[model samples]
Target chain A: MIAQGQTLPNATLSQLTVHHPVLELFAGKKVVLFAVPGAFTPTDSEAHLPGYIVLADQLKAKGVDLIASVSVNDAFVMKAWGEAQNAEEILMLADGDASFTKALGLEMDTAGFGGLRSQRYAMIIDNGVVTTLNVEAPKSFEVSNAETILAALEH
Target chain B: MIAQGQTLPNATLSQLTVHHPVLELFAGKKVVLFAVPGAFTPTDSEAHLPGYIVLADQLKAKGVDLIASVSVNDAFVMKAWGEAQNAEEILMLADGDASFTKALGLEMDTAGFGGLRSQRYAMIIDNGVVTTLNVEAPKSFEVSNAETILAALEH
Candidate 1:
């Protein structure tokens, strides 16, 4: 696993036609980079993102300058899910080919689920350096929830 | 341009969790493959697809065994679009990484409009050879429409 103090990967993520380099967005900024296994999946849509959506202001209140979400799905679906979730407070990044997920060694064989998907995790990036990391177990939702991040940030 | 007699590339495309190999799907069948700039775009949703949806039976009657549509979007969005369009007669393939699009040398610098989008075109693939190909000019949807293909098949 990538540990604290490691720099984030450089990847060209997309939001429609807008290609964003990961370091460019997280470097020089305090970001909450959360990744989900799939878009609109039960835990992610039900609690993961909704929790963050509910606590986005609080996260920013605790000195987080930006909030970004990553998934292995393409930009179009990410955009659709963001709108469905009303995630204006979050930047939904699409790592369509798993460029970011594979680079982090977080890609999982999810053939029984959705081909290859990213593992559910969250990280606190302070100007491109990892400061905090939380990853959830398979079929489990813990450690990576917004409450966990909030508690870590406050602590 | 990839002409009729050229073999289709071996690429893995997806629809939700199902990964389909292009050769496997088209190896022994006659297939009609069409590509749009993007899903949810006005022309694709309003006019282009309605034409195909209305004439799917006619196209199949002309010895076309499969009708597939492709876009440079993820499978999730493609599924949603397919459901929205009631496109039971169409195979909505997601070329999230544009692997097939790039292989055909049809990728255009469409970032100014809609990122790197596939040019609008349609092809008739009999077994593994391209039997008929129709490419539309920029901003013109004349040649690639269902009517054009029907005419070509009749002649």
Candidate 2:
């Protein structure tokens, strides 16, 4: 997994079928980046992504230039889920094949149920370098929620 | 690609997060199975899947026990798309890892735009064996639409 103080590996992610290079997305920006196992899943749709959407304004107020969420779902699914959640403030990015997640070493196998998925994690990225990182334990949603990141930014 | 007179390889698929064995889904049943490149894409959402849903009853009337649409999407996305389309009559199956699609030799690389996806195709399976198959040419929608499958059932 990518750790604090490490530069994000070069990879590609998508939004609405438009591809964006990872480095370009975070270059010279303060980004609050979060990843979910799958889009539209109960925990992610109800709590994880929504919490970020609810706190998007506050996160921006705290100097977060971008609040992005990535999942191992296709760009179409990511776009649909974002629309369903009213996440216009969020950059709903797709790591469609887990390539970007795998590059970060944050990919997890769901024992064939979901195949490869991104582990739930959040990071504060400054100019393509990870400043703060929080990865959730398996089946646990601690240390990676919007509240935690918002609290972290207080420092 | 699986052709007519071939038995489908054993694999697992998901619907509403529940895992289902591939052979089990077709066992002792006549199934009209279709694959789309991705869920919620423009062509897929507007044309391919909606066509199946529109003609689902007619397909069932022709001794088709199941009308399933599989995509390289997670179960959550599949379920959400199904609900969005009001596809109650269509079995929205998720080939999350493309394992099932690969086993059928029908997986397509979307040139990093959408990653690995199922090639658009349709088939008729009776008692776990393919009786008719139609795989579309690249970037083509011919022979895989609901009308073609329905027409195939006539003969």
Candidate 3:
């Protein structure tokens, strides 16, 4: 997994109609990027993503230039989920083939379940370098919640 | 690719909370199975899946015991899409890892766009054996539509 002080690996993520280059998106900006196991799943739609949506302004108020969410889903699914959740404040990015997740070594294989999902994690990136990285343990959601990141930014 | 007279390769597919064994689901049933590139995508949401949803009754009336739509997406996405489209009559099956798509040699690589997806196609299975197969050509959608499959069943 990518660690603090390391540069984000190059990968293209999609949302709606646009393709974003990961490094380019994070360059010259302070960004909070979070990943979910799968879009529209229980934890993601009910807790993980909703927390970020509810706290988007607070995160942005703390000098965060962008808040983006990534999952191993296609752009269309991401778009639908974002719309369903009313997540207009955050960028819903799709790592369709798990390329970005694999690049970060955060890919989780769900065996016979959903298969090839991203681990739940959040990172604070400053000008393309990771500053704070928090990855949750398997089937756990303790450290990566939006409140934790917002609190971390208070320092 | 699986063709006429071949039995479907065994694979487990998910829908909402239940996992279905492909062979078991088709055994002793006359089933119409279709594959789309991705759930919630333009062609799929706008046309392909909608076609099946619209003509579901007519197909069922023609001795088709079940009508299913498969995509290389997770079950959550499939369930959300099914609800969005009011597709109660058609079973939305998720081949999350493209495992079922690969087993049938129907996987399509979308390069930088959407990554691994299933090729657009439809087939009729009688008692777990394919009786008719209609695979669409690249960027085309002539044979796999519900009307075409319906007319084929009329013969």
Chain B TM-scores per candidate, in order, are: 0.95, 0.97, 0.97
TM-score (chain A only) for the predictions, listed in order:
0.96, 0.97, 0.98
Native A-B contact fraction in model 3: 0.49
Ten contiguous residues with the weakest lDDT in model 3 chain B: B108-117
Best by TM-score: 3
Give per-candidate clash totals: 0, 0, 0
Report the lDDT of model 2 for residue B71: 90
**What digit string (tens of lDDT, one per residue) describes model 2 on residues A1-155?**
77899999889898773679989978999999999998889999899998999999999999999999999887878888888999989999988778999889999998555677899999999999999999999999989999999999999
The sequence of per-residue lDDT tens digits that candidate 3 reaches over residues B20-130 is: 999998899999999999888888999998998889999988989999999988888889999999999999999987899999999989865666789999999999899
Clashing pairs in 1: none
Q: Show where candidate 1 strays beyond 4 Å.
A: A9-13, A16-24, A27-29, A40-43, A108-117, A138-140, B1-31, B35-51, B54-66, B70-74, B84-89, B94-121, B125-130, B133-145
* Superposed Cα deviation of residue A70, candidate 2 (Å): 1.2
Instruction: Tell me the spans in candidate 3 whose CA falls farther than 4 Å from its real position.
Output: none
Global local distance difference test of model 1: 0.82
TM-score of each: 0.68, 0.94, 0.97
- Which CAPRI tier for candidate 2? medium
